[PDB]
Amino acid sequence: NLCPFGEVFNATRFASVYAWNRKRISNCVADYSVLYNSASFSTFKCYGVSPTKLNDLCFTNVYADSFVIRGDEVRQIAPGQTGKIADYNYKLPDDFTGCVIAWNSNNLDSKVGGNYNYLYRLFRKSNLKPFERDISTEIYQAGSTPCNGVEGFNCYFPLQSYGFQPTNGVGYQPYRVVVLSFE
């Protein structure tokens, strides 16, 4: 049995970072050589393991989380980081054991006039727990007047769109991220 890594990396759609997918990898043989031997991956950072020593270990379960963020924000997909993505969208624990990889997906995820399918949470009253993320659409009460479900002043929708556009600099271009957790 080959682990379904191709189902995660070469997927047609990717999730928004606030609603990122997790596929639980179980009861299979995983060949991590086809991964670290690829020119597409602009980032291949591993924590707690060596990328070439991967094909020598076993684990009970492997988790593959995937989503789309900006290139500016891949630096937050790492243990001990802060920022609107780590704090309010995707949080890695400080004792993280696994690999974080990313690659530029401008030609896939950005479009002329802006791509408004990819969203991130901009407002949350508390930091996410590592491996705790919310799907909520309740509007954010920024004042003392309750909002009563009416988006207005001091009553903001919690998500914005990236509006990925193919013309911006590299830091604003969409990047697809896959995080592998080992346990």
């Epitope: 920022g83 704090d87 309010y88 407002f123 009253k125 001091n154 914005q160 509006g163 600099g169």
Partner: antibody, heavy 117, light 108 residues
């Protein structure tokens, strides 16, 4: 109706410390991105520090290790603890609400900080 | 950091004329640019954000354009209370930086 009122400015000696305060009226500072922006007399604008709605804090490189941003939920107050003040830091200090750590849509009137011997 | 250079430094026009202010970024900031107005002795006021979206209560004679490194702010029909100092501020990367300002004085 909404309001941001700075306080705690004045004359201070070099190397001394100072604490700035900003009272909010309709905004709950604990639920917002709040920022401090300073303006030297006759020069431009310079962002100082921000506190995220979740507690994360960031500082401009010119005030790192010396300034500390904080807030106080029982009094709905944004605070800036300035230490080791130089001449340099003489400016009018504004508290602004920060919309998503992007732009500054609502400002206060400012308080003047003078660092002179 | 991004250095925002505004031009011209001083813009001397008569009320009713059309004002065009430029702001250049040292490197691209996409549409993450805001414009502010400051009158002497009082605090800055948000005019547009997102390079082209007016803030709340901003008259339609204010409009923004541009993306990447080139931005323009345009007052179409200058009212007498539009004569002030105008700053641009980027929130694309790095520390958030302001322009050094353009004054729109009155010509006579």
């Amino acid at each position: 109706e909404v309001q941001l009122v700075e306080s705690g400015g004045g004359l201070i000696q070099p190397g001394g410390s100072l604490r700035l305060s900003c009272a909010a009226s309709e905004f709950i500072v604990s639920r917002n991105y709040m920022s401090w922006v300073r303006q030297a007399p006759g020069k431009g604008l310079e962002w100082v520090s921000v506190i995220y709605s979740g507690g994360s804090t960031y500082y401009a490189d010119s005030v790192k290790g010396r300034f500390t941003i904080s807030r106080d939920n029982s009094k709905n107050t944004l605070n800036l603890q300035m230490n080791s003040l130089r001449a340099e830091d003489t400016a009018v200090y504004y508290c602004a609400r920060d919309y998503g750590d992007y732009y500054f849509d609502y400002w206060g009137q400012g308080t003047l900080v003078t660092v002179s011997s | 950091e991004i250095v925002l250079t505004q031009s011209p430094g001083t813009l001397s026009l008569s009320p009713g004329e059309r004002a065009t202010l430029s702001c250049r970024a040292s490197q691209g900031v996409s549409s993450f640019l805001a414009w502010y107005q400051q009158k002497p002795g009082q605090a800055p006021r948000l005019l547009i954000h997102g390079a082209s979206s007016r803030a709340t209560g901003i008259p339609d004679r204010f409009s923004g354009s541009g993306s990447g490194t080139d931005f323009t702010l345009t007052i179409t029909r200058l009212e007498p209370e539009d004569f002030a100092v105008y700053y641009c501020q980027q929130y694309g990367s790095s520390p958030r930086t302001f322009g050094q300002g353009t004054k729109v004085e009155i010509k006579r």
